[PDB]
Coordinates of C-alpha atoms in Angstrom, one line a residue:
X115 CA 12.4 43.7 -34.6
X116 CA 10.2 41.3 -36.8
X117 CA 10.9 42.9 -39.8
X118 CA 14.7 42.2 -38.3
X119 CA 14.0 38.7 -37.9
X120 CA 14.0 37.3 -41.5
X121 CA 17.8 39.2 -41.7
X122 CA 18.8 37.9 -38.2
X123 CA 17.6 34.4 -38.5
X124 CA 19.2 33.6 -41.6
X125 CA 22.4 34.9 -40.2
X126 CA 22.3 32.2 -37.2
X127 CA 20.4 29.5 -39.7
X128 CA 24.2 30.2 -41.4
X129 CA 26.3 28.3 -39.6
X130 CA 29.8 27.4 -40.5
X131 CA 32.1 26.6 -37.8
X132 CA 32.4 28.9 -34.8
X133 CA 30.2 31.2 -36.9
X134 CA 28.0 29.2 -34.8
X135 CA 29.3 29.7 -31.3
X136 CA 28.9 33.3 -31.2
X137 CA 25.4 32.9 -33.6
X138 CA 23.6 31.2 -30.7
X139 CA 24.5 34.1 -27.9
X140 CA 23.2 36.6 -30.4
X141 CA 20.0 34.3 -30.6
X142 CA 19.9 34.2 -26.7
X143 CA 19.9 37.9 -26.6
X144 CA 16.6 37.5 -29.1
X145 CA 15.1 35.4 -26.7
X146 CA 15.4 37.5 -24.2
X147 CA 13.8 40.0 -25.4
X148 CA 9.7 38.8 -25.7
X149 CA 8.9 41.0 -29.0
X150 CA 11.8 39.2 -30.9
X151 CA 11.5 36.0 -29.4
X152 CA 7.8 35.9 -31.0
X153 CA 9.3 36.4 -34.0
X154 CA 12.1 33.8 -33.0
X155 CA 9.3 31.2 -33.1
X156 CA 6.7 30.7 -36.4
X157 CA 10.6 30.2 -38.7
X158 CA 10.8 26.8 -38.9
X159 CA 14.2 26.8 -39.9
X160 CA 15.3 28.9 -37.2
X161 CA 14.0 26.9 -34.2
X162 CA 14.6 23.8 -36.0
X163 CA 18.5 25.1 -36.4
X164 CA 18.5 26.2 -32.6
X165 CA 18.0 22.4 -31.8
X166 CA 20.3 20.7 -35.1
X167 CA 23.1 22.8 -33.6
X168 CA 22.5 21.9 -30.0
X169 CA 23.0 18.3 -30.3
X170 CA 26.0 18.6 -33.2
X171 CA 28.0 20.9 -31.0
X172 CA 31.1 20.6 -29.1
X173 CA 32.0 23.9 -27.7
X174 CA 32.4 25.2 -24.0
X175 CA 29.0 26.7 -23.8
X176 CA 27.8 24.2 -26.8
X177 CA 23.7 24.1 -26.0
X178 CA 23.7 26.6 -22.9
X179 CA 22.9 29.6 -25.3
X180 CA 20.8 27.4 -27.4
X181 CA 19.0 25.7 -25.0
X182 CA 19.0 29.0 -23.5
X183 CA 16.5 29.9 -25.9
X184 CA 14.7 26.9 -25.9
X185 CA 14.1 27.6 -22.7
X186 CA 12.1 30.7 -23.5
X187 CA 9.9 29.3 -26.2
X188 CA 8.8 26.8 -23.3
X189 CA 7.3 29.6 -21.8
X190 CA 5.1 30.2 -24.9
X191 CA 2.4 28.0 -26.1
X192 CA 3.6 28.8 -29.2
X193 CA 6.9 28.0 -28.1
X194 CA 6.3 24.5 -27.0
X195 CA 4.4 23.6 -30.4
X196 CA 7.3 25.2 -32.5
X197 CA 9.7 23.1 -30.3
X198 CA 7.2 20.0 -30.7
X199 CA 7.6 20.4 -34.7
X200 CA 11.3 20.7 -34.6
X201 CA 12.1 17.6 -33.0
X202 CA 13.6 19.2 -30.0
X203 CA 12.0 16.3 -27.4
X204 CA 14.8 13.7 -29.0
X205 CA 17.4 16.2 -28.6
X206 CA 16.5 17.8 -25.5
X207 CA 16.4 14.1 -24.3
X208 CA 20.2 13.4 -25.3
X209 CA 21.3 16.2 -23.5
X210 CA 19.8 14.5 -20.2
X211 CA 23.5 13.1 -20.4
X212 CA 24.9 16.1 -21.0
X213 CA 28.3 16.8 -18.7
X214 CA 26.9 20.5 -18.5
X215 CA 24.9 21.5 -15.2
X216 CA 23.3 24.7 -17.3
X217 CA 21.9 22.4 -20.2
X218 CA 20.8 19.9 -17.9
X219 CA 18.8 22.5 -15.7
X220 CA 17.5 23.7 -19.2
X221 CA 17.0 20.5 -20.6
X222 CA 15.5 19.1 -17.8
X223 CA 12.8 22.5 -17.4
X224 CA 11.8 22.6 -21.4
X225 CA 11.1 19.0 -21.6
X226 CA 9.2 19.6 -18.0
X227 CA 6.8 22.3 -19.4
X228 CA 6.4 20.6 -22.4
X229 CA 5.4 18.0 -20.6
X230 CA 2.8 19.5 -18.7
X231 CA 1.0 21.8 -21.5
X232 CA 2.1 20.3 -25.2
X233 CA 0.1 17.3 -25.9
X234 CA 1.9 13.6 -27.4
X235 CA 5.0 15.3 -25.5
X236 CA 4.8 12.2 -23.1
X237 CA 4.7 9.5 -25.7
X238 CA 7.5 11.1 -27.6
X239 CA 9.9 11.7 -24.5
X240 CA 9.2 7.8 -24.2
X241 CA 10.4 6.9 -27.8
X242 CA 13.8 9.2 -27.6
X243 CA 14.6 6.8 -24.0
X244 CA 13.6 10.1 -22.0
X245 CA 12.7 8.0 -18.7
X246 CA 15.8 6.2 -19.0
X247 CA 17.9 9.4 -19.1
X248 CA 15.8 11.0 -16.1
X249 CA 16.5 8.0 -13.6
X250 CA 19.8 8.5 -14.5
X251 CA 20.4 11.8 -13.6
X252 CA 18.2 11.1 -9.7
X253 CA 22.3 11.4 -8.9
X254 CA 22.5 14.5 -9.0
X255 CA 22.4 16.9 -5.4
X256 CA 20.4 19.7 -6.8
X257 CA 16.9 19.3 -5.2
X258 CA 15.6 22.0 -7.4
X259 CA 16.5 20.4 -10.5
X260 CA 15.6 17.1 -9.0
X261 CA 12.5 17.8 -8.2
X262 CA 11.6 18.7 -11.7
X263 CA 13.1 15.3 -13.2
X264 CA 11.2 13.3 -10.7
X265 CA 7.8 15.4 -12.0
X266 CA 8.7 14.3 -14.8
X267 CA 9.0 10.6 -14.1
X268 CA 5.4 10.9 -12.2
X269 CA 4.1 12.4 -15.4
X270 CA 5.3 9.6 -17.7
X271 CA 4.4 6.8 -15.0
X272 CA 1.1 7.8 -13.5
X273 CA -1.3 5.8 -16.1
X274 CA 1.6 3.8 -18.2
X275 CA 2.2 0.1 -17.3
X276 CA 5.2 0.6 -19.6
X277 CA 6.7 3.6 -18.3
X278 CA 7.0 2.0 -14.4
X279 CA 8.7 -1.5 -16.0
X280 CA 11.4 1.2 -17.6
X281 CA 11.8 3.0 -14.3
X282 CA 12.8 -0.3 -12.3
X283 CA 14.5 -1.5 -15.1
X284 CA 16.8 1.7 -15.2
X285 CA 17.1 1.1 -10.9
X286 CA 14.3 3.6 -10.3
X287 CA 13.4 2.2 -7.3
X288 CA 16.4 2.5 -5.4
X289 CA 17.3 5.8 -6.7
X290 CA 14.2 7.2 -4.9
X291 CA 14.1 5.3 -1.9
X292 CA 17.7 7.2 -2.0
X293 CA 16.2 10.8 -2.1
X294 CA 13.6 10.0 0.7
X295 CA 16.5 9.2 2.9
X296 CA 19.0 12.2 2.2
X297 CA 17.0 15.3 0.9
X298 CA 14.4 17.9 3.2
X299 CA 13.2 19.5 0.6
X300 CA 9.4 18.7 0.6
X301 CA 9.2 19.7 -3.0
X302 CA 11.3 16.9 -3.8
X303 CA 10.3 14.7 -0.9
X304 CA 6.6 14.9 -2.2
X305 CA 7.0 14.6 -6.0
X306 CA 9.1 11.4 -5.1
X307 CA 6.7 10.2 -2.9
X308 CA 4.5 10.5 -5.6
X309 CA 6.8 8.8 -8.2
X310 CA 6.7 6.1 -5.9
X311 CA 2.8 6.0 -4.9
X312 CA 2.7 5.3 -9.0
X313 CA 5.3 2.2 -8.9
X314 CA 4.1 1.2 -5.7
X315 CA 0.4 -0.2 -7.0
X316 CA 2.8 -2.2 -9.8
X317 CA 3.4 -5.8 -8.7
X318 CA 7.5 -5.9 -10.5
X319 CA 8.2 -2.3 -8.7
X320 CA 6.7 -3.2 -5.1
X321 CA 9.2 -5.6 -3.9
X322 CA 12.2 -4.2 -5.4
X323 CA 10.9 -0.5 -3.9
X324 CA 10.5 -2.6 -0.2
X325 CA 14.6 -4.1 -0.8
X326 CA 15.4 -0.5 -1.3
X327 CA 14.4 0.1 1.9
X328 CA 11.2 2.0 1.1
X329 CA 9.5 1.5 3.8
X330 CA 12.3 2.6 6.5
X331 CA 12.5 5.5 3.7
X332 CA 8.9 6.6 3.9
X333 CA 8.8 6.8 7.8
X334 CA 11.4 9.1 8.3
X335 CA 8.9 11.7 6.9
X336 CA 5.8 10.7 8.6
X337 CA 6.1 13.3 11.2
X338 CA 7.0 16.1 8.8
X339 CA 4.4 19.1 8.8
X340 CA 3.1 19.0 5.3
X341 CA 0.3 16.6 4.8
X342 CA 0.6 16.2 1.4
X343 CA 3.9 14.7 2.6
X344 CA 2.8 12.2 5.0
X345 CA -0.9 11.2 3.1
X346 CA 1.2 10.4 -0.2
X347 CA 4.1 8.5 2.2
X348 CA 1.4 6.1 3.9
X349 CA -0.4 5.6 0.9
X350 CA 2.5 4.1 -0.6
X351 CA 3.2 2.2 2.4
X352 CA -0.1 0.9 2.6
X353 CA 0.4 -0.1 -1.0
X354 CA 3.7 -2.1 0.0
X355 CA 3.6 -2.9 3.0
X356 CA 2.6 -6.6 2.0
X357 CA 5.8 -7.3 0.6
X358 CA 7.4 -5.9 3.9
X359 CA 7.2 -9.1 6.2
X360 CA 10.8 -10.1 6.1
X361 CA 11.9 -6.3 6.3
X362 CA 13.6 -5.6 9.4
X363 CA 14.9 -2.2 11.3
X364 CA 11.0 -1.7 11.4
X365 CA 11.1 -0.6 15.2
X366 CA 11.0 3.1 14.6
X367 CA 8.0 3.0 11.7
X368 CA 6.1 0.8 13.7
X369 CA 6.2 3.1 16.5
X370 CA 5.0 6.1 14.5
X371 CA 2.3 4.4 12.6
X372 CA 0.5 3.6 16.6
X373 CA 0.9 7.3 17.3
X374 CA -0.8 8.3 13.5
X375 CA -3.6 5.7 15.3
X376 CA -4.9 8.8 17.1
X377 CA -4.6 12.0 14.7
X378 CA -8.5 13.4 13.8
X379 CA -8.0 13.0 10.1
X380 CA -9.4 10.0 8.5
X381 CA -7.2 9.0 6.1
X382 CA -4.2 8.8 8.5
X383 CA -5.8 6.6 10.5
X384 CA -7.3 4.4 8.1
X385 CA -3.8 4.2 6.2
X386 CA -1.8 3.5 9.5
X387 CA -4.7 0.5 10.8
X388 CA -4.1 -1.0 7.2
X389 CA 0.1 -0.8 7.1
X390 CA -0.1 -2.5 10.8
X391 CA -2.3 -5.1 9.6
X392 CA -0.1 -6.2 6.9
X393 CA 3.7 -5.7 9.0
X394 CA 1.9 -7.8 12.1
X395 CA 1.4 -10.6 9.7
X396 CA 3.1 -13.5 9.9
X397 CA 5.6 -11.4 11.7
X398 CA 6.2 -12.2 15.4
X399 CA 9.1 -9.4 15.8
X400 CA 6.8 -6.5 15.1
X401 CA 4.1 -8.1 16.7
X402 CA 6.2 -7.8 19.8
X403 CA 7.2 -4.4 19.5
X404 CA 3.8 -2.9 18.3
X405 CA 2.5 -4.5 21.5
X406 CA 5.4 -2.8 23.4
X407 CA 4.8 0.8 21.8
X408 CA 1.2 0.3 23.5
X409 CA -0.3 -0.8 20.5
X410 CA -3.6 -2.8 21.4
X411 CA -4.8 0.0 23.4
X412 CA -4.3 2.2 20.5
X413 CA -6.1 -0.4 18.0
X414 CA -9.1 -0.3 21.1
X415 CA -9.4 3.4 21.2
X416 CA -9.4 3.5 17.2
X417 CA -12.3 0.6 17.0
X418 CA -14.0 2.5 19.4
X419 CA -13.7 6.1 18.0
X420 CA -14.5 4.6 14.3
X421 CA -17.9 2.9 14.8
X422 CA -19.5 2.2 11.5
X423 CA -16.6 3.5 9.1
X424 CA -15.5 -0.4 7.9
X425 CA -12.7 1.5 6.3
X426 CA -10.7 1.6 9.9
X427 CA -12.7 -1.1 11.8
X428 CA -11.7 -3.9 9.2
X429 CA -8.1 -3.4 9.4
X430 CA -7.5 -2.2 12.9
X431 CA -9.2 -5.4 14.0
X432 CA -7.2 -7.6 11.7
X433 CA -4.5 -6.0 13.7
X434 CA -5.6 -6.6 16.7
X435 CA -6.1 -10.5 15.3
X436 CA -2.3 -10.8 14.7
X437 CA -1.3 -9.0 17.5
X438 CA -3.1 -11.4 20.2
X439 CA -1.7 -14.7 18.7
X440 CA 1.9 -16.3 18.2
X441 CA 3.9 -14.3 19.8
X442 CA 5.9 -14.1 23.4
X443 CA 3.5 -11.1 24.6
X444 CA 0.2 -12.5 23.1
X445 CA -1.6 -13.6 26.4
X446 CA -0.9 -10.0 27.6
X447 CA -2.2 -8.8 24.5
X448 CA -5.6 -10.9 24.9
X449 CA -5.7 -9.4 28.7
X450 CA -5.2 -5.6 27.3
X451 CA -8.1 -5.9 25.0
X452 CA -10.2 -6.6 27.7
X453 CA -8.9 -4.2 29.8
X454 CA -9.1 -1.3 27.3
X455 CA -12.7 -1.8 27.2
X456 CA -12.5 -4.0 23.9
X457 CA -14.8 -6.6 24.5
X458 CA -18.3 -5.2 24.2
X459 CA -17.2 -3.1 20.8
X460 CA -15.7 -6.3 19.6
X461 CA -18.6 -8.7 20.0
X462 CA -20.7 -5.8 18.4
X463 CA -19.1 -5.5 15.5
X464 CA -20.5 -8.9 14.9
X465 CA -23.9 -8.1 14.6
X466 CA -25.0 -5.6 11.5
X467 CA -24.1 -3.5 9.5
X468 CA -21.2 -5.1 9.7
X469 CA -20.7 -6.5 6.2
X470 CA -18.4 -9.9 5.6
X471 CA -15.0 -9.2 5.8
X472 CA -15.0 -7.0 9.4
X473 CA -17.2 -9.6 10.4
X474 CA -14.6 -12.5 9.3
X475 CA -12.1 -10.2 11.0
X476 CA -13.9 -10.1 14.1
X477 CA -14.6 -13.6 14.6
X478 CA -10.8 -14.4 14.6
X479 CA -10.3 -11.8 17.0
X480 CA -12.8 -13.4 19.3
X481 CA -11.0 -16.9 19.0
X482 CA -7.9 -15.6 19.8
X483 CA -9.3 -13.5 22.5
X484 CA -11.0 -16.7 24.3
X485 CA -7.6 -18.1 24.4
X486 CA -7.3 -16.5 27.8
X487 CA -9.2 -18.2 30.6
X488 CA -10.3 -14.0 32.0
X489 CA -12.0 -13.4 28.4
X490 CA -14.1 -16.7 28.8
X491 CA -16.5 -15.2 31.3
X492 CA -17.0 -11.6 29.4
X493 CA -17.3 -12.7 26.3
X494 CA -20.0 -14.9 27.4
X495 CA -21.7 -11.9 29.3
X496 CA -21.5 -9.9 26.0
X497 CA -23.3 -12.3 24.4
X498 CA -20.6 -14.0 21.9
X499 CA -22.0 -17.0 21.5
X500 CA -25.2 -16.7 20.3
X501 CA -24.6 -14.7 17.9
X502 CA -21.7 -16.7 16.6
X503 CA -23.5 -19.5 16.1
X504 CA -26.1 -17.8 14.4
X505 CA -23.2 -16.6 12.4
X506 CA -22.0 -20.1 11.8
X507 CA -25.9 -21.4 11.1
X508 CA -26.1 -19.4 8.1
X509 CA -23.3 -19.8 6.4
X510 CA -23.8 -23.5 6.8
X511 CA -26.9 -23.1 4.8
X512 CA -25.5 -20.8 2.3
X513 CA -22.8 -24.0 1.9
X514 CA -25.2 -26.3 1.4
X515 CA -27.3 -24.3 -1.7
X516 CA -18.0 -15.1 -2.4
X517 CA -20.2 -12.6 -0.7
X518 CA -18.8 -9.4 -0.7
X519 CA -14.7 -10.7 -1.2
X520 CA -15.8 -13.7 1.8
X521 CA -16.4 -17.6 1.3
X522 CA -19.1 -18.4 3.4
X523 CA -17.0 -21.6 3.9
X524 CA -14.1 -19.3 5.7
X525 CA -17.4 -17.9 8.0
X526 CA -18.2 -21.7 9.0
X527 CA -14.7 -22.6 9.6
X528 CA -14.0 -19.3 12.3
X529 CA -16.7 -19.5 14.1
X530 CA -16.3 -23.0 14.8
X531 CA -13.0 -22.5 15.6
X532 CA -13.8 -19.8 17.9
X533 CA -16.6 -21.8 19.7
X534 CA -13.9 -24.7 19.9
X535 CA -12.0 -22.5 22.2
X536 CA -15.1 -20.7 23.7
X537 CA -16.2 -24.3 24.6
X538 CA -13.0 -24.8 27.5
X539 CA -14.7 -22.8 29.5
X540 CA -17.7 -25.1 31.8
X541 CA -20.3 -22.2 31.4
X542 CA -19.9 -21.1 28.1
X543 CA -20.1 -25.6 27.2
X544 CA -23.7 -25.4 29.0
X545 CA -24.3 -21.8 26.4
X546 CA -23.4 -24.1 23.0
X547 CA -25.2 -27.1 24.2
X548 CA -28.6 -25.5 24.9
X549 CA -28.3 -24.0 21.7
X550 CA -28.7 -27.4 20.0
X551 CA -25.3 -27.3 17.8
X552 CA -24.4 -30.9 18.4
X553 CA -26.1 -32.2 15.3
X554 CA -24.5 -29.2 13.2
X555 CA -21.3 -30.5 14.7
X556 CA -21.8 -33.6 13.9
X557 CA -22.8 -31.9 10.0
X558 CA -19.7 -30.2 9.8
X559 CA -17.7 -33.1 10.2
X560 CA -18.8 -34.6 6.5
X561 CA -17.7 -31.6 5.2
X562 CA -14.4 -31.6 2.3
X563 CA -12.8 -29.0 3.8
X564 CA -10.3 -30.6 6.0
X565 CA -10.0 -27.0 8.6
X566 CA -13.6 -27.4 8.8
X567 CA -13.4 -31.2 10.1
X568 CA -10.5 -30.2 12.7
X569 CA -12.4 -27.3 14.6
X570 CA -16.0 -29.8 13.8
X571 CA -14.1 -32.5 16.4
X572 CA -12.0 -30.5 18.2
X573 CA -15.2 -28.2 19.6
X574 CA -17.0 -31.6 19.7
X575 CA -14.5 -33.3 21.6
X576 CA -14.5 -30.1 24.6
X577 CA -18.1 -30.9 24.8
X578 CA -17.8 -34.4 25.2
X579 CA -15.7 -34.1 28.3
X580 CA -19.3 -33.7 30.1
X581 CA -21.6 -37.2 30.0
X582 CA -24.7 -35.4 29.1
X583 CA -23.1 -33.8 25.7
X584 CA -20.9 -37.1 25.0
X585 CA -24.2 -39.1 24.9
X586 CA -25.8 -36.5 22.8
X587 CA -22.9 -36.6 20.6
X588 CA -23.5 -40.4 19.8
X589 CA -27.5 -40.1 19.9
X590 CA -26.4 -38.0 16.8
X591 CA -24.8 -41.0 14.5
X592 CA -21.2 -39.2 15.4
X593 CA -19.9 -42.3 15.7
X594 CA -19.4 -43.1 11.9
X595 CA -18.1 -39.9 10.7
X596 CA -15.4 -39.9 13.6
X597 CA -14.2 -43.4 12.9
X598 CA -13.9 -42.5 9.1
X599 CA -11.9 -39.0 10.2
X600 CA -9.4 -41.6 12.6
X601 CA -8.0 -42.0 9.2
X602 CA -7.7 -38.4 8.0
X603 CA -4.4 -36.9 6.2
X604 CA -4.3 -34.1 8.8
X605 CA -2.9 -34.9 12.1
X606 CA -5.5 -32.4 14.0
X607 CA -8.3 -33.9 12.7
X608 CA -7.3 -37.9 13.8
X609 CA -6.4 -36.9 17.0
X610 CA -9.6 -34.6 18.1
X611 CA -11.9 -38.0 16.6
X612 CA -10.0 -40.5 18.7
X613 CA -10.9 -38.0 21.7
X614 CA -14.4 -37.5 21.2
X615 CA -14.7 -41.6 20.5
X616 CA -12.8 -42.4 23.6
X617 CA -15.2 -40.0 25.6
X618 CA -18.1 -41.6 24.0
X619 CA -17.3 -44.9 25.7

């Protein structure tokens, strides 16, 4: 039928009025047929007329036929460069808003495959307003034809700054999150999770996704059997969950994300440690209900089970920071560390290799963990103190001549703070004195950084409360520093040097 084909293509390449209507079926028949669709494709004029016709067309059936065909010379890779040098891609692309559901679904799969296998197809899809067109049509309720727009839309995003500004501009984001609520197909569900894991890492699409309601979105499928599912949902809830603070409803994700604290695969745990990190921030609601849901002895089990892998240690104990501070059940937070055998894994994780920031981590654990008068005694017996002044002793010196995303100035300023509330206790006062911190005390309270003078005196002024230490303390010159801080712009720092001063005399 290829000596056929120069007679029938210039019957269709005709065209006249209705001629037309009836010259497209004929042409659908050709493509269906493989031997005279290969000879449908290498005329120019031919394919090039298949797509003229398709967008200049009014009839009932107007671009079903021709698209039709289209269709088939997508499943060639000659096809897809014959369609390429026609200019189908800007067609193709206005009849994303075609009323049709046949053209769309054909539309929608030639554009998809060229896409995939004909190169510059992305960047021209993006000059005809493809991505505009395809967010457009995430209202449709067939999941087999949205998950091949959304492919799309990862396609054109994934790697294009440009592409994911378009998408939220065009109300991408909440067209998504809108699919992860209503559909089960995990096709779908996992190409949209993927659509957004792409927007997610943008800093314009990571709030708006989170007002969508992303995040309730997302963990509505963390139990679902298909990893893929799950791995590309808390990946992009790792990615926004720092924009979720205010975000409420929360109780049933939060839940979840303790249970994922136990599964045996890596990056489930390491993704659920980091998204309860960054919702227990600043966040005294779900610091309450992770602590309900059993939470710190989940985060104690996970410390222990991790060992050297930073990955999970670093955030797991950042969540166990939050979780034992500023909130109603904090002091029974601080008990259930100790009780979940936390103590000895946490004042290890102090010591190397533990590299800056689990080690910053760690030390504002330990300072909200000596808030409770039972952790003063085991922490002691663990050995906390000495190595958090050595701690504290070396940054001081790195001071005075960012190590791995830390300020050694952050290093000086927690484990002060820790020892400050360490120091309450009578035993652990006689443990920080022998060590001969007084005149580094005394050091920190020159120092510009006005955090750093407030734990300086505050830890200096639980000493002084013995008559031994207090006279030590003003052997050491103390007494100038502290009358110069009596004047200081923060309110903790005046009132901790009018203490050790009055102690003093």
């Amino acid at each position: 039928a290829t000596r056929a084909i120069p007679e029938l293509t210039k019957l269709l390449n005709d065209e006249d009025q209705v001629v037309v209507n009836k010259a497209a079926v004929m042409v659908h028949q050709l493509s269906k047929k493989e031997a005279s669709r290969h000879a449908i494709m290498r005329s120019p004029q031919m394919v090039s007329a298949i797509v003229r016709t398709m967008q200049n067309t009014n009839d009932v059936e107007t671009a079903r036929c021709t698209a039709g065909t289209l269709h088939n010379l997508s499943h060639h890779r000659e096809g897809l460069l014959a369609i390429f040098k026609s200019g189908g891609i800007p067609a193709l692309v206005k009849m994303l808003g075609s009323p049709v559901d046949s053209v769309l679904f054909y539309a929608i799969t030639t554009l998809h495959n060229l896409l995939l296998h004909q190169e510059g197809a992305k960047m021209a899809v993006r000059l005809a307003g493809g991505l505009q067109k395809m967010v457009a049509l995430l209202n449709k309720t067939n999941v087999k034809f949205l998950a091949i727009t959304t492919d799309c839309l990862q396609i054109l995003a994934y790697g294009n700054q440009e592409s994911k500004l378009i998408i939220l501009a065009s109300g991408g984001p909440q067209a998504l999150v809108n699919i992860m609520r209503t559909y089960t197909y995990e096709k779908l569900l996992w190409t949209t999770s993927r659509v957004l894991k792409v927007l997610s890492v943008c800093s314009s699409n990571k709030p708006a996704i989170v007002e969508a309601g992303g995040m309730q979105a997302l963990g509505l499928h963390l139990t679902d059997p298909s990893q893929r599912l799950v791995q590309n949902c808390l990946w992009t809830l790792r990615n926004l969950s720092d924009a979720a603070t205010k975000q409420e409803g929360m109780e049933g994700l939060l839940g979840t994300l303790v249970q994922l604290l136990g599964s045996d695969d890596i990056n489930v745990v390491t993704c659920a440690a980091g998204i309860l990190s960054n919702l227990t921030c600043n966040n005294y609601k779900n610091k309450m209900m992770v602590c309900q849901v059993g939470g710190i002895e989940a985060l104690v089990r996970t410390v222990l089970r991790a060992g050297d892998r930073e990955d999970i240690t670093e955030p797991a104990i950042c969540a166990l920071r939050h979780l034992t501070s500023r909130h109603q059940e904090a002091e029974m937070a601080q008990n259930a560390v100790r009780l979940h055998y936390g103590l000895p894994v946490v004042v290890k994780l102090l010591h190397p290799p533990s590299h800056w920031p689990l080690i910053k981590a760690t030390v504002g654990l330990i300072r909200n963990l000596a808030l409770c008068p039972a952790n003063h005694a085991p922490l002691r017996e663990q050995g906390a103190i000495p190595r958090l002044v050595q701690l504290l002793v070396r940054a001081h010196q790195d001071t005075q001549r960012f190590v791995e995303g830390v300020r050694m100035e952050e290093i000086v300023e927690g484990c002060t703070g820790a020892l400050h509330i360490l120091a309450r206790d009578v035993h652990n006062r006689i443990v920080i004195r022998g060590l001969n911190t007084i005149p580094l005390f005394v050091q920190l309270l020159y120092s510009p950084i006005e955090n750093i003078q407030r734990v300086a005196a505050g830890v200096l002024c639980e000493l002084a409360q013995d008559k031994e230490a207090a006279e030590a303390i003003e052997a050491e010159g103390a007494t100038a520093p502290l009358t110069e801080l009596l004047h200081s712009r923060n309110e903790g720092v005046a009132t901790y040097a009018a203490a050790v001063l009055f102690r003093m005399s």
